[PDB]
Amino acid sequence: SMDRHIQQTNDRLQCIKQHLQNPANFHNAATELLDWCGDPRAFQRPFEQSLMGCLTVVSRVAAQQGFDLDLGYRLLAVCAANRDKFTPKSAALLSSWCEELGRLLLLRHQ
């Protein structure tokens, strides 16, 4: 059940947000978040602010040295696929951040 302890899920997402900032924890934290975004119930308004906070960090750090760019990109791609569940401003940000990570990922493979 997802909505019986909403504060707990937001606290978990805020912890994940903090750990995504650290290259030593990004792999586990971004994996946690990708797994969580694979549950279709994750895309609901009570979680959206915390989720956007996580994704904001991913947009910033994924292409930095010591971070896993492809995992970041795969995570942003799932959220971009669900972007119509977010506010219009957030949906536009997701699309932008996903595309930018994809460009960076392409450049490394060229």
UniProtKB/Swiss-Prot annotation:
Summary of the function given for this chain in its UniProt record: Acts as a transcriptional coactivator. Increases ligand-dependent transcriptional activity of AR and promotes AR sumoylation. The stimulation of AR activity is dependent upon sumoylation. Also functions as a transcriptional coactivator in the TGF-beta signaling pathway by increasing the activity of the SMAD3/SMAD4 transcriptional complex. Involved in transcriptional activation of a subset of NOTCH1 target genes including MYC. Involved in thymocyte and T cell development. Involved in the regulation of postmitotic positioning of pyramidal neurons in the developing cerebral cortex.
Superkingdom, natural source: Eukaryota
Reported impact of residue 89 to R: In NEDDFSA; leads to altered positioning of pyramidal neurons
Cell location: Nucleus, Nucleoplasm; Cytoplasm; Nucleus
Domain comment, as recorded: The SP-RING-type domain mediates interaction with SMAD3 and SMAD4.
Lineage of source species: Eukaryota, Metazoa, Chordata, Craniata, Vertebrata
Linked residues for Glycyl lysine isopeptide (Lys-Gly) (interchain with G-Cter in SUMO2): 89
Subunit structure: Interacts with AR, but not with ESR1, NR3C1, PGR, THRB nor VDR. Interacts with NOTCH1 and RBPJ. Interacts with SMARCA4. Interacts (via SP-RING-type domain) with SMAD3 and SMAD4 (via MH2 domain).
Region (Sufficient for transactivation activity): 1-110
Record protein name field: Zinc finger MIZ domain-containing protein 1
Free-text tissue specificity from the UniProt record: Expressed most abundantly in ovary and, at lower levels, in prostate, spleen and testis. Weak expression, if any, in thymus, small intestine, colon and peripheral blood leukocytes.
Disease field: Neurodevelopmental disorder with dysmorphic facies and distal skeletal anomalies: An autosomal dominant disorder characterized by intellectual disability, developmental delay, poor language acquisition, behavioral abnormalities, growth failure, feeding difficulties, microcephaly, facial dysmorphism, and mild skeletal anomalies of the hands and feet.
Parent-protein start and end of this portion: 3 to 112 of 1067
